Design a protein around this motif. Sequence first.
Motif, PDB file in Angstrom:
ATOM      1  N   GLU C  83       8.205 -14.105 -37.180  1.00 37.53           N
ATOM      2  CA  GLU C  83       6.885 -13.726 -37.408  1.00 37.53           C
ATOM      3  C   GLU C  83       6.499 -13.302 -38.570  1.00 37.53           C
ATOM      4  N   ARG C 124       8.202 -12.470 -27.029  1.00 39.26           N
ATOM      5  CA  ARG C 124       8.287 -11.631 -27.135  1.00 39.26           C
ATOM      6  C   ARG C 124       7.094 -11.580 -26.192  1.00 39.26           C
ATOM      7  N   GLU C 130      -0.190 -10.058 -24.990  1.00 34.01           N
ATOM      8  CA  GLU C 130      -1.136  -9.192 -25.795  1.00 34.01           C
ATOM      9  C   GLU C 130      -1.010  -9.957 -27.608  1.00 34.01           C
ATOM     10  N   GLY C 131      -1.546 -10.394 -28.502  1.00 35.61           N
ATOM     11  CA  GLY C 131      -1.231 -10.684 -29.824  1.00 35.61           C
ATOM     12  C   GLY C 131      -1.108 -12.186 -29.208  1.00 35.61           C
ATOM     13  N   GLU C 134      -4.311 -14.859 -31.303  1.00 40.92           N
ATOM     14  CA  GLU C 134      -4.481 -13.324 -32.507  1.00 40.92           C
ATOM     15  C   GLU C 134      -3.455 -14.831 -33.704  1.00 40.92           C
ATOM     16  N   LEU C 135      -1.957 -14.498 -32.639  1.00 42.29           N
ATOM     17  CA  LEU C 135      -0.787 -15.813 -33.139  1.00 42.29           C
ATOM     18  C   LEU C 135      -1.532 -17.017 -33.584  1.00 42.29           C
ATOM     19  N   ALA C 137      -4.214 -18.067 -33.790  1.00 39.81           N
ATOM     20  CA  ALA C 137      -5.207 -18.386 -34.523  1.00 39.81           C
ATOM     21  C   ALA C 137      -4.712 -18.777 -35.943  1.00 39.81           C
ATOM     22  N   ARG C 138      -4.057 -17.797 -36.724  1.00 36.29           N
ATOM     23  CA  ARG C 138      -3.651 -17.440 -37.773  1.00 36.29           C
ATOM     24  C   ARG C 138      -2.622 -18.222 -37.890  1.00 36.29           C
ATOM     25  N   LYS C 202     -13.195 -22.833 -34.144  1.00 38.03           N
ATOM     26  CA  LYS C 202     -13.959 -22.005 -35.136  1.00 38.03           C
ATOM     27  C   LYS C 202     -13.129 -22.079 -36.299  1.00 38.03           C
ATOM     28  N   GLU C 203     -11.581 -21.903 -36.380  1.00 41.20           N
ATOM     29  CA  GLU C 203     -10.834 -21.524 -37.805  1.00 41.20           C
ATOM     30  C   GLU C 203     -10.741 -23.104 -37.885  1.00 41.20           C
TER      31      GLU C 203
END
Lengths: 393, 393, 395, 393
Positions: C83, C124, C130-131, C134-135, C137-138, C202-203
Amino acid sequence: TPVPFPEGFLWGASTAAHQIEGNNTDSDWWVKEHAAGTHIAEPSLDACDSYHRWPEDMDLLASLGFTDYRFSVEWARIEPVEGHFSRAQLAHYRRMVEGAIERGLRPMVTLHHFTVPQWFEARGGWTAEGAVELFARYVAACAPVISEGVSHVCTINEPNMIAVMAGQAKRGDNSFPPAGLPTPDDETTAAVIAAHHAAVKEVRALDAGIQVGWTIANQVYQALPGAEDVTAAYRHPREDVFIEAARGDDWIGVQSYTRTRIGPEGPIPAADDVERTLTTWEYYPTAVGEALRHTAAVVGDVPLIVTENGIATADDSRRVDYYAGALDEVASALADGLDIRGYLAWSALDNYEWGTYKATFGLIAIDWETFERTPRDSAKWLGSLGRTRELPR
Amino acid sequence: TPVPFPEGFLWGASTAAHQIEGNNTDSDWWVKEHAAGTHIAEPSLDACDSYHRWPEDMDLLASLGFTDYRFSVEWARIEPVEGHFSRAQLAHYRRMVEGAIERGLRPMVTLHHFTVPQWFEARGGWTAEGAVELFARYVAACAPVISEGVSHVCTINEPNMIAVMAGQAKRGDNSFPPAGLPTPDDETTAAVIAAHHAAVKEVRALDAGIQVGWTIANQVYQALPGAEDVTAAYRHPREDVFIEAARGDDWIGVQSYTRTRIGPEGPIPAADDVERTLTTWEYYPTAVGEALRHTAAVVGDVPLIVTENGIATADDSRRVDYYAGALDEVASALADGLDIRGYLAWSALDNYEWGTYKATFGLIAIDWETFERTPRDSAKWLGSLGRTRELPR
Amino acid sequence: KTPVPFPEGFLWGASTAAHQIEGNNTDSDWWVKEHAAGTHIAEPSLDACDSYHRWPEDMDLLASLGFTDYRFSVEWARIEPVEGHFSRAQLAHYRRMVEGAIERGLRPMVTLHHFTVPQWFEARGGWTAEGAVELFARYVAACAPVISEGVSHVCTINEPNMIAVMAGQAKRGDNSFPPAGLPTPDDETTAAVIAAHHAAVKEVRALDAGIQVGWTIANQVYQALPGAEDVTAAYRHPREDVFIEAARGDDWIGVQSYTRTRIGPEGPIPAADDVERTLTTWEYYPTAVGEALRHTAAVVGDVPLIVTENGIATADDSRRVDYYAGALDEVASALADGLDIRGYLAWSALDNYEWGTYKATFGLIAIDWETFERTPRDSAKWLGSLGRTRELPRT
Amino acid sequence: TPVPFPEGFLWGASTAAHQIEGNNTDSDWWVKEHAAGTHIAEPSLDACDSYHRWPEDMDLLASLGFTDYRFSVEWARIEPVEGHFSRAQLAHYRRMVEGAIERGLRPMVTLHHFTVPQWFEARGGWTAEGAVELFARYVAACAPVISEGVSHVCTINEPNMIAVMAGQAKRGDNSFPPAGLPTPDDETTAAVIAAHHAAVKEVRALDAGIQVGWTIANQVYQALPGAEDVTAAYRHPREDVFIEAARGDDWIGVQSYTRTRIGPEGPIPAADDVERTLTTWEYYPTAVGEALRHTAAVVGDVPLIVTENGIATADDSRRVDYYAGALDEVASALADGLDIRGYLAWSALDNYEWGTYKATFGLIAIDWETFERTPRDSAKWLGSLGRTRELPR
């Protein structure tokens, strides 16, 4: 063919703080009752003013012959702002406990009966992070109320009804179906069960010999000939799971009013060829019989107490009929060897029926202007059984 | 070649309460109409007095041969003060519904048509906290007017026009651009979509087989070469978002009158020499074709109903011309496979055109002094098609 | 009846997935599950086709056969093996794949995620943690050096409906599977993958490279028996349509079709015992992709369609030919009926790891698991030739 | 060439707390820096440990010749939980002010520099109900820090950049555009303006004669020939609206680094050949000249101060060249008669550039392992101008 009371059998009636007290202004309901575009028909306001007038409530019950009183203690009052506990309000509810004993009544204390602090609602409610801890802390704060004088404690009243409503709320649905219950929210179900167990531990840890459990909105679902698979799958999330989570408790509360028949499609409403009550339910005095027997089956060994049982009506003669049918079923249950340790009618007083005052459940009538009590014929008869210690057929 | 009506095809005309009823004195428009410094040229006052004379309107429509009548029911009357529902007014609108059925008209009911109770405006309107809950409560309160005999219900008429107007209100512009629509307010858009969904849930909750959706102010934006992208961008917040939000409804209303050309720099005014109506819009009978076809593309399989379509003129012959072109496009769409299930002309009556009585849209003429109805030749023709059940070309 | 010419720029090729062909994908969730104590997974992935080394050969073969396009995936598990520790080495590897596809005259369609996740992402708590959004998209943002240039079509998440359906099984702890239909999808995972997809779109668009982004659907071709269409649509909605609905503002959408499933009043009806089957146990149904294209178009509106997967598991390449003949007829029919279809990609270029077994051979090109030798089948040579012909035959 | 300083002209450098202090662990940025899937390249951690080492910072600025120091005071520390003000952290920041005074530096104190308490973020941030009051109370709580020895206070650093980033966060856009700024959030715009006016009031209420204002992220937007309107429309929400709000303030801060050309289609990237800095921006020494002049025009007679001006480079040679161009523009601005009261270089130290330590802005170099300060040549030259008091050309 009449059945004596078991030793120490609870015999009384039940109320809830929001429904009788009046001026419960830091609750979620007080906000919902005055919020823009509420479907709540009328606000609670003063209710019966039992905040001031519980001494009279208890005097009347004791006078009538009843030996027990089930009442709730309000979190919204005790913790009106998150983390600011009111010693004043704790002392208030402590005097309720003392006053019960002082008047020859055994006080059964419900710690949570639907309403919550508004801040608790605003956080996100039962589903939010920390909700179990917050409730656990409230229960621990109630120690001075319940440490001496109380034998039975209910943690959460009708957790299954909280969960059903939590379902409606998350979907934005404002109407509850013709028959049956809204699909419960699974996340709320888990939350209240965890809160319940947390609370049980907090009560037991006072080491005061307190018997702690919670109460079930028993629906008495009935399968039509070939709809057992449906009836079972429809019932488990709405009742049985909550009974299952209580298999480790000191007692369990049975709360019964009516029935609902399930067919292959799902729950079926009653026809017009069946008498109704002022809540539009089917008139069904023998509901508490099936509620009890089914509860025993799921719960196992755990002792049973009918914590609510009654009827909304203006005709008290018809109420007497309901209770004769119900007490007949309670008698029959005991005979068949069910371990049932008490009976508490709903309700001691006419009260706020969560949005209306027209649905009068009371053994005792209330003038909404003067707050004068008036015991109905039902109340004098049920009261007298407190002395007779014998259930009729 | 003429196109047969689908089985159960709606065929009739449309009105809105504020525009025909008269003495709608608790609406926001009544206040606007008489407020200090109002830009509204004429007040509504008595309009057609359809509050009293809706039996007359209905006797005429049936007699002409129409089988359907879309009318609106007025929140401002039903809830003239916040939280105070008028049973008298609910019964008034119920009798309207019962009245249409008696006279062989299928009533389509609009629950909201632009006007609101003045108190809802004074509060802060659609973007105020509680607005959605207030509307859904209004909708629930309309249960007894729509729960029987009503097959179609419109929740909110032309929400896109509300959002556009809310943009003007917010900026403080009493003007209007020479072509196109003012920038919609985003917050109002969200609000009316939320209100709609909420309302659809309530109407379906009645479990009465009611087909519910809302109606769209189709602008028929036409991209000239170079402006295919600019049109998409201009159109989307003004029209398409409202159609997208309808994709899970039982039907959707198409409402069309004119077209607006769009070039690389935005919407172009209609040319100096084009034929015009009494609203100063361009005469364009084929608008409804592009509106149906665009709505079909975005909404998918949701059945289409033309809920408004007509022309403001003193020349009824030109109205016959307008409707000849319109029904041709309707027939053309049906032949191309579009699922269109109704056609409703705007308007059944000459009416208050949101600030003037000069812009006469009526199939039926209204003497403003005597309230005499006179069916125009246009109405005699269109109405007869309810019997022949054929669209001409 | 008459052959239908390719639209200009029409994608014509075949598809793979990194885990199923690459070999030594040892930081994925699947590597761990394949070797976990008490694993129900029949056989492990191990070296697979060793396309990690031999993708140059894969691509040479595809160009040689006449194909003009190659859909492959890029592996998160490699790119982010721990990660927050992005491998420039593995990003360069996958960039060399893109570049190398162009140098061999193939147009590369890139899949950013194809089922497998990094092990730590499973550890995880997966998609509903949660997250998670975001993970993802990154990770998509980190893939910019791969898709910056030379790439016109990107898929964010392959078959999100299948992720959602499988999430239900893991939740409920069933290692089994119904005789027909799919398990009830997890609502929580559904929302997660939808959110993840939009953030991903979007990215990719933010690169301002003119990339056409979307995702691909596991189309099931649910056919209501003449009885109840209401049961069918209710069944289909969370298993399919909600994911198509969510793609209505995307640049394109992928149709992935293989078989059909009939639905009656009670629920999904399994194919009869005397009907023809493939090696996956599915009913042989060449014409599925026709219905898949049509239902997708109906739901997604005017978004362009690309068939990103279409094939058959069989040891009889002659029957593979008959499958594709039926399939190509339906694509042809759909184009003539005026559906906006911009491509066709068969599953699969290679025999590959079928999520637990090497037995179900979907490949146009055969693989020897011991030598890694490629042998194009007659199906590959036929289908490949349409890349030059640029014309769909009929039945 | 050389131009003399006005009397009492500020001459120094600027820092921000999060960027230099280290261990700012109750800020939103600390959580953001370590959240799952954070796009923030590297975390802040220790920064320059100016939490401990600000005495050395100030010693060096002093001995170099600077006479002023703009530093920030940190809300996350002062109120690390809502309603719990740390006297310890207030005393900390009081000693910084007194520390500046001992060493012969005039402190300009920034009350807010992007970072907020995590609880303020979790609460909903700047647009959430009560945000203005929460900020105003914090500013009031800062009284013992600023009520003595401080002549200039900055309420909120670069509020346009706050509005812009809130724009990103509302939409879920993680990527900046190739040039220009993303669309600001209008609610955040309004909230920061209101919070600023409240803060100014709180600071003037001290009656200690404090000059109070806020600083602007000047973009130096430039109209390509004929794009003077698209430029105007683009620039107003991104910059001017915040200058317009400062017209009643005692001063305004100009913060300038680079420029952005705007053409008819909007902002355009600088050419591929043109020199760049370590932040990717175009090398543009004269930016500050246009920032000053644009700001004066919009703001009126409010005194201007350059609160930030610098370059991210590994080449101090080039930093010197940058400042020669900048200070020349400042002197040109003075001689044209703009009311300019100070110049403060960004930054005194290499620091956390909001996600990276690579982008070195400092006059003084920082070793991230040992926390060694090393004044660069740029520092020695600029510092010496605090003694000579001649703006070079």
